[PDB]
């Protein structure tokens with residue numbers, strides 16, 4: 038229960054995210070997006086998926102431009118319109134006797150101090 | 152002369168314990184709203200007090216009619 | 229407008245929730261007082277000291 | 289928060305140090321923790337995270353000696369007595385065996401105390 | 411149910427808001443009406459006035 | 468059983484939270500074998516003499532308080548007299 | 554597993570009274586809490602017994618007290634024990650606070666215990682006033698009239714609060730009824746707050762005169778500290794029985810054996826002795842609102858102590874400046890009490906003003922300065938020993 | 941007494957008023973302090989005449 042509460046609290050905290058966290062995450066995502074394609078199979082799979090879903094393979098310049106536009110206020114808006122006090126779907130397997138019921142779990146996704 | 156010289160865009164601001172001006176500026180609306188709520192609660196919990204009734208509630212128009220006494224010549228002995 | 233604006237205004241943060249609760253309570257007290265005053269005044273016709281005054285003392 | 293002793297400021301001027309040395313000697317004699325054989329560093333509080341972490345980074349022999357010193361001091365304090373004039377703590381053995389470790393721990397904690405406050409000046 | 415979540419959430423919160431308003435009004439009323447007993451009783455308020463004959467001195 | 472509490476500094480017997488001990492030997496004697504009130508007057512007298520000698524001046528200098536009390540009382544009595552109003 | 558560690562209630566008793574690790578070198582100044590508990594129990598029992606013969610009204614309280622004294626079986630014991638125990642309560646309270654202040658027990662991790670104790674002290678002071686105002690003698694009437702008038706210092710609703718508390722326009726039957734009703738309830742709240750005090754203390758244990766950690770050496774409370782408190786209990790009994798059986802009206806002023814005449818103003822309107830220093834602090838300042846503000850602050854300043862001690866050491870055992878300044882402050886407190894007790898004459902005004910200035914300076918200026926100086930001197934001497 | 945709340949005596953004192961023997965402050969027939977360390981005059985409560993009687997307070 039402590040783990041679930043802290044996880045959902047950190048989820049809800051994104052409504053007031055700072056500016057250094059956003060920049061660090063942007064740099065990490067920009068690095069990790071094009072760093073997982075080493076073998077030819079991975080590159081071919083990425084090309085196939087990207088062309089299948091959207092319809093074009095975005096150039097790295099376009100990806101850099103789209104990532105650059107992100108600011109902290111956009112993160113706050115998205116977290117407020119998607120995460121802040123919204124329905125969740127859970128699924129547990131194993132020894133879950135200590136996992137509390139649904140309402141208590143959901144109550145932690147919206148902080149009451151604000 | 153820079154934290155992380157390779158990235159001079161960063162800086163360190165004064166702080167006591169996770170208390171920074173950037174975070175301080177964010178919590179001001181919450182403090183203002185809480186103060187307004189507390190003031191409204193204190194107001195609503197004390198509105199039959201004679202001094203408050205005769206000083207604050209009575210002079211306001213369209214509300215003072217209800218908050219005024221309606222005792223004719225039959226009054227205090 | 230729709231229904232999301234209502235949630236955005238009062239039911240978004242607890243601070244903007246308690247204030248709405250208190251203001252609504254303050255108005256509801258006055259409303260209920262007016263209602264009960266009107267109903268009690270309508271209930272008793274010709275049965276209170278103010279409406280039996282002229283019969284007794286106005287004749288002296 | 290925490291002690292704010294300003295001996296470093298005084299030590300800049302040798303005039304003040306030379307003038308104040310006898311007063312400091314008399315004050316340390318007057319405090320009288322040496323009569324129980326204790327070192328000055330056994331009297332600092334250990335109830336926070338920093339000191340509890342620092343006490344775990346001490347050499348084993350130092351920890352055992354500190355345990356013995358504190359036990360002997362408590363046993364002396366039980367029956368209201370002091371050590372004889374020959375077993376008092378000499379100035380040679382009254383050194384700082386805890387300050388560097390605590391300073392290192394505080395520096396590590398202070399190090400982290402900056403990344404979270406980081407802002408982008410653009 | 412057949413609806414969007416915001417409508418259901420607003421409907422759920424409105425009942426709690428009405429609950430809080432009515433409870434606060436009742437609590438204020440009972441608190442004032444029970445602490446008004448400590449005020450000056452109607453018996454003492456009758457003896458506050460004093461009457462003296464002006465021509466008897 | 469009940470719950471995992473906060474961070475404290477006492478524990479209980481066994482896990483008292485102290486540091487690891489080594490090479491400590493402790494002796495004692497049964498209370499029914501030792502003679503009570505043995506070495507009492509000598510030790511008590513020596514300890515009292517030492518305590519009076521060392522922490523005496525920290526208390527003795529209640530010294531100026533009595534003097535200011537006496538001076539204030541005497542001056543207040545003097546000023547409330549025939550010659551004090553001259 | 555033994556029964557005492559298995560059954561719930563017996564486990565509750567055992568964890569606090571029988572098996573509880575304690576420092577092995579705590580002096581005789583650590584017994585005052587048990588004395589406080591015994592005195593509180595005695596007060597509760599004696600008050601319950603006394604409430605069976607007291608009629609709370611203007612025209613019957615004094616006669617009821619006299620009938621208790623000279624007509625009820627062994628009533629003099631009841632009244633004398635109540636009064637003398639109420640007097641001893643404040644002596645033991647002051648000794649407890651002095652013990653907590655001298656050894657630096659307000660520092661972490663025992664701040665919550667300190668705050669709870671301060672709240673208990675305030676509640677006890679409030680309870681004492683209502684208790685002494687009941688007999689409706691001369692000093693009770695006039696002191697209540699003076700003190701309850703201090704509520705007019707608040708801005709807005711000034712005299713309205715005074716009228717509400719008085720239940721009329723002057724001290725009469727309703728205010729005595731209110732005071733008797735309230736004097737019965739407060740001791741139970743005090744007992745509950747004492748239980749909270751103990752449960753907050755028990756999580757970390759008591760300190761020791763040395764000021765170092767006592768986790769290395771501990772002994773159980775059952776055989777050792779249950780017999781070290783008996784001496785103090787018997788000494789307190791021998792102290793209180795002499796007062797009850799040879800000088801019952803010891804701390805009692807001559808003006809406390811007369812009916813409350815609302816027309817003859819006494820020469821001096823003073824409260825009981827244990828509240829004298831705060832009265833002196835209140836009377837020192839010529840202003841009115843400043844007087845009550847300072848009177849409140851004189852007791853509320855004990856909450857600012859933890860954030861005012863810049864000392865690496867915890868206590869005054871190894872603090873040469875602290876030992877001097879503590880006794881200086883105690884002497885100043887005694888001087889304040891003496892000044893408050895006496896008349897507001899010419900020189901006494903100056904003496905009281907100076908004493909109040911020193912009292913408020915000790916908590917705000919002296920402590921940080923001398924703690925910093927001691928730290929600096931010790932650090933400098935230690936640093937300048939190898940070379 | 942506005943001085944220290946003592947009971948003076950009417951007509952006592954050469955000013956034909958109230959004289960306070962606690963400290964020696966005299967008043968006049970109009971209740972105005974003129975001799976003694978008394979700081980202020982004497983207060984009058986509100987009233988309103990009716991018939992031949994009077995109501996005080």
Ligand SMILES: CCCCCCCCCCCCCCCC(=O)OC[C@H](COP(=O)([O-])OCC[N+](C)(C)C)OC(=O)CCCCCCCCCCCCCCC
Nearest residue numbers: 554555556557558559560561562563564565566567568571
């Ligand atoms: C009137 C006010 C005082 C009234 C009396 C006040 C005192 C009341 C008794 C003292 C408090 C109760 C005892 C608490 C400790 C206890 O539980 O002792 C019970 C013992 C066995 O306890 P044990 O040591 O833990 O062993 C059992 C462990 N197993 C095997 C279960 C794992 O078993 C025994 O050997 C003794 C069992 C007796 C149980 C109590 C009986 C009630 C008292 C009867 C009256 C006694 C005579 C009184 C004369 C004055």
Ligand SMILES: CCCCCCCCCCCCCCCC(=O)OC[C@H](COP(=O)(O)OCCN)OC(=O)CCCCCCCCCCCCCCC
Nearest residue numbers: 122139140141142143144145146147426427429430433434
């Ligand atoms: C003693 C009482 C006397 C006065 C009675 C009037 C009280 C007015 C209360 C107003 C209605 C409650 C609105 C809160 C709704 C809410 O916010 O519910 C939210 C919380 C938790 O749900 P959640 O966050 O997990 O939801 C998750 C959403 N996704 O539920 C509660 O905490 C219930 C609290 C109700 C009030 C307590 C009643 C029980 C006390 C009496 C029983 C014990 C008696 C002890 C002796 C006195």
Ligand SMILES: CCCCCCCCCCCCCCCC(=O)OC[C@H](COP(=O)(O)OCCN)OC(=O)CCCCCCCCCCCCCCC
Nearest residue numbers: 199260261432433435436437438439440441442443444445
């Ligand atoms: C602190 C002491 C509390 C002790 C506990 C007593 C038992 C509590 C039971 C509460 C039931 C209502 C009592 C009647 C009071 C009264 O008088 O209702 C009379 C009042 C009239 O008010 P008026 O004369 O000002 O109208 C002025 C006309 N010009 O009608 C109302 O406003 C209706 C309000 C609703 C009634 C209460 C609704 C339930 C409240 C639950 C929360 C209770 C909180 C309790 C806090 C301790």
Ligand SMILES: CCCCCCCCCCCCCCCC(=O)OC[C@H](COP(=O)(O)OCCN)OC(=O)CCCCCCCCCCCCCCC
Nearest residue numbers: 196197199200201442445446449707708709710713714717
């Ligand atoms: C700067 C402070 C400003 C705050 C002003 C608002 C304060 C009120 C807050 C809530 C109190 C509710 C009490 C209910 C009324 C009552 O208990 O009794 C109401 C009484 C009797 O009314 P009645 O019989 O004459 O009429 C009956 C009508 N049918 O009225 C009064 O005696 C007026 C005086 C009461 C004032 C209450 C004071 C409560 C403590 C306030 C402490 C302030 C400390 C400030 C420190 C700087």
Ligand SMILES: CCCCCCCCCCCCCCCC(=O)OC[C@H](COP(=O)(O)OCCN)OC(=O)CCCCCCCCCCCCCCC
Nearest residue numbers: 586587590591594775776777778779780782783786787790
């Ligand atoms: C004012 C009234 C107080 C009570 C009156 C005196 C009571 C009788 C005392 C005379 C005989 C004592 C027993 C001798 C030793 C023994 O025989 O047993 C020894 C036991 C320990 O057990 P042990 O197994 O280690 O013993 C060794 C092997 N059998 O120590 C005791 O029990 C001490 C008894 C004292 C009773 C408590 C006194 C302290 C009260 C603290 C108050 C706390 C707050 C209370 C709030 C209400």
Ligand code: HEM
Nearest residue numbers: 596597600601603604607636639681684685687688737740
């Ligand atoms: C900490 C608890 C208490 C304190 C400090 C205290 C204090 C006092 C004081 C100082 C007096 C004045 C007595 C006098 O001047 O002669 C008094 C009187 C009185 N008390 Fe208490 N008391 C306490 C507990 C109780 C309790 C619990 C009750 C009732 C259950 C009670 C009932 C009375 C009564 C009836 C009187 C009037 C009798 C008299 O004055 O002789 N008291 N109290």
Ligand code: HEM
Nearest residue numbers: 583586587589590650653658666667670671674747759760
């Ligand atoms: C009815 C009143 C009180 C009761 C029953 C009570 C109970 C106790 C007891 C039994 C102790 C253990 C003895 C000790 O450590 O000294 C204690 C400790 C303590 N008390 Fe009290 N006390 C009371 C009043 C107060 C007051 C008025 C204060 C402060 C203003 C206070 C502050 C403390 C502190 C700080 C400790 C811890 C001391 C330490 O651990 O060294 N207490 N209390």
Ligand code: FES
Nearest residue numbers: 946960962963965
């Ligand atoms: S008190 Fe009456 S004139 Fe001085």
